[PDB]
Antibody, heavy 213, light 213 residues
Framework: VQLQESGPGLVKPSETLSLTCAVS?????????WGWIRQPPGKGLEWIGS???????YYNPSLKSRVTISVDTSKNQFSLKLSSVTAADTAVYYC????????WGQGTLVTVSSASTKGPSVFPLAPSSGGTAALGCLVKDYFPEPVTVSWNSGALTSGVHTFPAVLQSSGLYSLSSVVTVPSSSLGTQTYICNVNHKPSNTKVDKKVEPKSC | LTQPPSVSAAPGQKVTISCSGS????????VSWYQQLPGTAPKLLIY???KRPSGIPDRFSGSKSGTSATLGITGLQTGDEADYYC??????????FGGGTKLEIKRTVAAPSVFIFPPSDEQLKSGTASVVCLLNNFYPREAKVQWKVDNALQSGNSQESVTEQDSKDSTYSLSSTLTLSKADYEKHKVYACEVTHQGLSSPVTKSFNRGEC
């Protein structure tokens, strides 16, 4: 059983947020209830609404006039529409459902903002200078969040740190991702950072090579 | 539903996390508990006050007494660091959640390893210079980074961010970025990051001279 949210990462103020929850490995018609919960960055969980197998819906009263939850049995998915959004609706949105233990999706960040999508530039943090070397990638000047960074297509996970992005005074985010590796590897082992800014459909594979000093 | 912002203890010890509610939520209804490891969805630990779903180990337990409920975690290990949430139903039988408690594992002190990265030539060509100072795998979280450019203390033109405790060694890492324009970067030679941390007998400075790499 897998739940996966999908929907735009950026919505403009006053417009309608639409999200979908694709259900795999389980027939959407068989589920006892399906629902949505959201989590503003840095904050706690807020229930949005649920729908039961019968079609009956229940919504958070503080959101009720703006929420629609529905199910499409044929697409095997269910949906959330939230009208008239403001910055207050910026959050990670989770779909969940009970088939004792609800399945949760992985969540999708929706940012409500009048700023526009902008893809990142990817710059190397080249190794240089205790038998260990640090290297990384600087993922700069993108909007909205998030970006994901892997190393060597997922083969390199030990010693990786991908930092929280910072919101620059420019209104754009920047993020660094680093890894520490044996100094003796730098001549022979290729290090590539795999960057993926889904809001802008920007994917970059950047080789990080030792500088000449 | 109120819970404390944080709780901490050493590996192998026990913590409790309490959820204080009212007669009309916890007082009338079942209580669930959730673990939210950073970047993942909440995961159910306890339901119906005290029941563990399949695959949750008996290090976790729950109970309810009057208008409060408590999660216990024994045998604390690296990788238990997470936000823990209680959930129940309100007077309308709609889900409500506590604000979250962040668990910190109190490991031994570890001084950071420090690395400094000049801007890449690629970024410089585009008109900006990001200088990055990395503080790797330290404990506890308190750390101070001071930037100096030809011995001029930099105030207000840097931003930093810190990872969550590491799932293998319970340390933090921190990345600080100093931003200058290209024209300003080319006006100076010596770029230095000085790091203060309880694990260091005196502050550590990493520096480079512009143009040596």
């Amino acid at each position: 059983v897998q739940l996966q949210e999908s929907g735009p990462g950026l919505v403009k103020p006053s417009e309608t947020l639409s999200l979908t929850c694709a259900v795999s490995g389980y027939s959407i018609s068989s589920g006892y209830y399906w629902g949505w919960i959201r989590q503003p960055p840095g904050k706690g969980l807020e229930w949005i609404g649920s729908i039961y197998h019968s079609g009956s819906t229940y919504y958070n009263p503080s959101l009720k006039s703006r929420v629609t939850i529905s199910v499409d049995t044929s697409k095997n998915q269910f949906s959330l529409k939230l009208s008239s959004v403001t910055a207050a609706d910026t959050a990670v949105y989770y779909c969940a459902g009970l088939t004792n233990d609800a399945n949760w999706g992985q969540g999708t960040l929706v940012t409500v903002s009048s700023a526009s999508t902008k893809g990142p530039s990817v710059f190397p943090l080249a190794p240089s200078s205790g038998g260990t070397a640090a290297l990384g990638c600087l993922v700069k000047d993108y909007f909205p969040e998030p970006v994901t960074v892997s190393w060597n297509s997922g083969a390199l996970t030990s010693g990786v740190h991908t930092f929280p992005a910072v919101l620059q005074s420019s209104g754009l985010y920047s993020l660094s991702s680093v890894v520490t590796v044996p100094s003796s590897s730098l001549g022979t082992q290729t290090y590539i950072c795999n960057v993926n800014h889904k809001p802008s459909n920007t994917k970059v594979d950047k080789k990080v090579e030792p500088k000449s000093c | 539903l109120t819970q404390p912002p944080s709780v901490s203890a050493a590996p192998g010890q026990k913590v409790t996390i309490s959820c204080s509610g009212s007669s009309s939520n916890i007082g009338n209804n079942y209580v669930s508990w959730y673990q939210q490891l950073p970047g993942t969805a909440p995961k159910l630990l306890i339901y119906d006050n005290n029941k563990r779903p399949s695959g949750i180990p008996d290090r976790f337990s729950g109970s309810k007494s009057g208008t409060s409920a408590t999660l216990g975690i024994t045998g604390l290990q690296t990788g238990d660091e997470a936000d823990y949430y209680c959930g129940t139903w309100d007077s309308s039988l709609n889900p409500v959640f506590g604000g979250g408690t962040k668990l910190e594992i109190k490991r031994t002190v570890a001084a950071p390893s420090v690395f400094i990265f000049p801007p890449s030539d690629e970024q410089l060509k585009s008109g900006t210079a990001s200088v990055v100072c990395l503080l790797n795998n330290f404990y506890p979280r308190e750390a101070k980074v001071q930037w100096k450019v030809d011995n001029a203390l930099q105030s207000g033109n840097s931003q930093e961010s810190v990872t969550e405790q590491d799932s293998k060694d319970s340390t933090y890492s921190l990345s600080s970025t100093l931003t200058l324009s290209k024209a300003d970067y080319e006006k100076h030679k010596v770029y230095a990051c000085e790091v203060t941390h309880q694990g260091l007998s005196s502050p550590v400075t990493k520096s480079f001279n512009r143009g040596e790499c």
